[PDB]
Design a protein around this ligand. Structure first.
Ligand code: MG
Ligand code: MG
Length: 98
RNA sequence: GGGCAGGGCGCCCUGGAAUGGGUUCGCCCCGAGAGAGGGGCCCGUGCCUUGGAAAGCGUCGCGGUUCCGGCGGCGUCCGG
């Protein structure tokens, strides 16, 4: 599933609710509003491990995106770069099924 | 020494930004958190004050007929 994840991301971007960035992703997972977290592969190792531990506490799925932050950003369609991304809800998608 | 200007910060908190925005003479900065608020720190050789007017200086006048840090009056102001 190379382009399937990208297509799902592009669909949830316009359909559901998302959170770009790290601090307000941490707020969402702490408040339990996050259903899925996506991490770029070049994010700092300590930050990555902290995110996984937080998600293990919150019983939430974490997916390691194949690309780095720049490609994650352009997959999300934003013109900046993002390391950590959160799905509040897909709305109309099957991303959280996988 | 004390206080306050005034400079700098790759320091923090709230919040999350595309219709992209902030900004320099140039640059440069931002979901690894911009703008917008509120704070914190450092240097403060500048200003005020303690020192400090008592001293210094500029003038006018008396002295020791001299050997005198001699004695007196006034001023040492406001701005760009
Ligand atoms: Mg700012
Ligand atoms: Mg005098």
């Amino acid at each position: 599933s190379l382009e399937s994840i990208n297509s799902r991301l592009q669909l949830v971007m316009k359909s559901g609710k998302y959170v770009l960035g790290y601090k307000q992703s941490l707020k969402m997972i702490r408040q339990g509003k996050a259903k899925l977290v996506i991490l770029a592969n070049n994010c700092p190792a300590l930050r990555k491990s902290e995110i996984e531990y937080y998600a293990m506490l919150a019983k939430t799925g974490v997916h390691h995106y194949s690309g780095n932050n720049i490609e994650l950003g352009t997959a999300c369609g934003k013109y900046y770069r993002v390391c950590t991304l959160s799905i509040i809800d897909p709305g109309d998608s099957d991303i959280i099924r996988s």
